[PDB]
């Protein structure tokens, strides 16, 4: 038979499941809704582990439970009373014999030890992967240190001592490939001559590689704490979502730089060379699975100042028109082909983050925090699972590093790119559009001619890599 449990009056997590405290979805069960007590019971369940649930819960719980209250609840979960001796044990003791204690030993082995270990696994995951709760609340950290540091008894000792060390390391806090990265490529600008770096003088292969390293690092830095609760859209977004905002602002700045390079090249022949070079960079982004970079280019070419430059488009080689069109097709129909391509490639990749942001925001806005059942309010956990499925997908693409060598000077050049200067956004984007009108006036105004601005060769070195011995 099943093990008997402590009285629910002394141990709250032994209350029977009912539709008044837990609802399952239609081979472990999936929870649709429940009280916080029932969620924590199933988070630390004696019959099975649920590592996905641990991640989901620790990512999203702050929408329904404060960190301080969560710690209190899992400490309460940990402190399980042992059953009293049974009749057979009593009779043995009355005869001076050692009791078999069969029911007690089974309850220790099959209830207490698994639940306690799974509580410690919640603590371990909390400290390792959601440490911001403790960075933001020193007293929460003190409570966790005290709890872990006072767990007695040999069954948990190895994990207690380990978690104590992990906490201490997190308080004061390397990649291997089997292949070598490819050689850094140079064009007109030579190593160390940062003053000559520009769109046409750096090698287009190396522009794409260094932007991909930069954009990959920005992508990998975004933590779920910047996303849950839609906090990047709220008044404190600069406080709560700084890595996400830095990533987006890089993407915006690069798109605007591409537009600026195009419309400030007033000579038609030179501007064709500029656009052709940007499409070559897009080709290398595609080869590297840098989808953020692909869409940076697509966004620039579809901007109002660039899209209208029909005389430039007419002189772009057909094969490059096709590259740009196929890249743009990724975004059509609500990113249908992008989503399929992302799910088919071999990482490393750099996803486009915007789709994740829209899906997290709409999941949060479009589902209720609670479900009302039998007069009770239950936490709508299905909603949190949906959010954590998105943050889990984000994290899966954050694991794989690029096998590309950093070039510190090219990296610094793109880190310091500032196409807007001191201008405000409207002033700058109006400037770009007025340049577009200058260099290719609206019909029937005639097309003017403009002098060349580049003193160096416009011919691209191409985007196939070279390999000396």
């Amino acid at each position: 038979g099943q093990m008997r449990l402590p009285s629910a009056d002394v141990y709250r997590f032994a209350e029977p499941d009912s539709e008044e405290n837990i609802i399952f979805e239609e081979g472990i069960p999936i929870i649709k809704a429940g009280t916080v007590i029932k969620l924590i019971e199933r988070l630390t369940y004696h019959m099975y582990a649920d590592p996905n649930f641990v991640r989901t819960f620790l990512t999203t719980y702050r929408s329904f439970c404060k960190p301080q209250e969560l710690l209190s609840l899992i400490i309460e979960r940990f402190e399980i009373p042992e059953p009293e001796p049974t009749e057979a044990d009593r009779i043995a003791i009355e005869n001076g014999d050692q009791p078999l204690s069969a029911e007690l030993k089974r309850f220790r082995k099959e209830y207490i030890q698994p639940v306690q270990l799974r509580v410690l696994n919640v603590c371990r995951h909390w400290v390792e992967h959601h440490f911001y709760d403790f960075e933001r609340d020193a007293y929460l950290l003190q409570r966790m240190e005290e709890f872990i540091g006072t767990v007695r008894g040999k069954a948990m000792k190895k994990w207690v001592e380990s978690i104590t060390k992990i906490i201490q390391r997190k308080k004061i806090a390397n990649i291997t490939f089997q292949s070598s990265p490819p050689t850094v490529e140079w064009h007109i600008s030579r190593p160390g001559h940062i003053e000559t770096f520009d769109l046409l003088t750096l090698h287009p292969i190396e522009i794409a590689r260094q932007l991909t390293l930069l954009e990959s690092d920005l992508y990998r830095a975004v933590q779920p704490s910047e996303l849950v609760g839609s906090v990047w859209t709220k008044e404190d977004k600069e406080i709560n979502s700084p890595n996400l905002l830095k990533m987006i602002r890089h993407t915006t700045n690069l798109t605007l730089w591409f537009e600026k390079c195009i419309v400030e090249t007033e000579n038609l022949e030179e501007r064709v060379a500029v656009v052709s070079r940007i499409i070559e960079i897009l080709q290398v982004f595609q080869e590297l699975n840098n989808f953020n970079g692909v869409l940076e280019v697509v966004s620039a070419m579809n901007s109002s100042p660039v899209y209208r430059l029909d005389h430039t488009f007419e002189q772009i080689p057909s094969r490059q028109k096709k590259i740009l069109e196929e890249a743009h097709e990724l975004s059509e129909d609500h990113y249908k082909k992008y989503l399929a391509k992302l799910r088919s490639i071999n990482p490393p990749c750099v996803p486009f983050f915007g789709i994740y942001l829209t899906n997290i925001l709409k999941t949060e806005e479009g589902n209720p925090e609670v479900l009302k059942r039998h007069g009770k309010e239950l936490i709508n956990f299905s909603k949190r699972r949906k959010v954590a499925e998105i943050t889990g997908e984000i994290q899966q693409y954050q694991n794989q590093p690029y096998c590309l060598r950093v070039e510190s000077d090219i990296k610094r050049f793109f880190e310091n790119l500032n196409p807007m200067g001191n201008s405000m956004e409207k002033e700058f984007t109006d400037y770009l559009f007025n340049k577009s009108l200058e260099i290719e006036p609206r019909n029937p105004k005639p097309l003017p001619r403009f002098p060349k601005k580049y003193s160096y060769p416009l011919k691209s070195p191409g985007v196939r890599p070279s390999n000396p011995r």
Partner: protein
Amino acid sequence: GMTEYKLVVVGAGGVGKSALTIQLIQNHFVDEYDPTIEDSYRKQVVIDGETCLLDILDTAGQEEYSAMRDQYMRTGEGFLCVFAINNTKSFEDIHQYREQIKRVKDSDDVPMVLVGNKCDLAARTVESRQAQDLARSYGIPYIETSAKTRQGVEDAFYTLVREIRQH
């Protein structure tokens, strides 16, 4: 077969803009949503006895990708320009959104509606007369909507479709 209208929702972030399309497309009568579901932004409707398909683009949450706005906007035939009635800045943003739509579509007469969205019980700061006056100065309809009761939501989208049909 039936006409498909490509509608685009634009407006300031962080003030409940997404509730407009969610409430439209939703199971009207179950408060639930999975935006990842292929065609959670397509809805077949009957407007003035004529059946059509609405395809709605709402990039809510991507407002910081400001250089993508032109590309997103160019996909649309009609636009809902949304502000929050308790956020004066979002109302003041409307002028620049409309100017950007006109530039992207290369037209001075783009089908659009002005939508004032009530996203919570915080105090209203934009009076309906102010928004009516703005809409009249642009020659476009004004619809007010609730983010919680679905009031006005159908009117906003159907009015926009009528603006497209009568363009």
